[PDB]
Amino acid sequence: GQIPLKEVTFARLNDNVRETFLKDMCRKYGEVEEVEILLHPRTRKHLGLARVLFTSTRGAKETVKNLHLTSVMGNIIHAQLDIKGQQRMKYYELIVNGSYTPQTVPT
């Protein structure tokens, strides 16, 4: 990467996986600085999307290694490194404006 890859984008999160769960879970894999869940602009419901910022690139990479395609609360997580929420924002747009749901967004 051309800059430090410290941030992970999650998609297809079960709607019970909110900020406290995310932080507790991701602390197993690296030191977590911040967690954020994205909500629908109108309903304020969970889009299955989240941002988790780590202190080190090692924490972001370990998180991706261990959680991508892992089932958490009965849904298979998508987890990838993301710069400036490029992919995360596309997924937001596809679910909110497009025809997709949180569990069917194409990644």
Indicate the domain borders of the chain.
1-107
- Residue 39's CB is within 10 A of a number of other CB atoms, namely 14
Q: Exposure string (b/e) for 20-32, b if CB count within 10 Å is 16 or more?
A: ebbeebbeebbeb
Element (H, E) at 75: strand 75-76
Phi, psi of 26 (to 5 degrees): -70, -25
CATH for 1-107 is 3.30.70.330
The answer to whether 96 touches 84, Cβ cutoff 8 Å, is: no
Q: How far apart are CA 31 and CA 6, in angstroms?
A: 11
The answer to whether 73 touches 16, Cβ cutoff 8 Å, is: yes
For residue 102, give the 3-state DSSP assignment: coil
- Residue 35's CB is within 10 A of a number of other CB atoms, namely 20
The answer to whether 91 touches 49, Cβ cutoff 8 Å, is: yes
**What is the experimental resolution, given in Å to one decimal place?**
1.3
Method used to obtain the model: X-ray
85: exposed, middle or buried (Cβ count in 10 Å: 0-12, 13-18, 19+)? middle
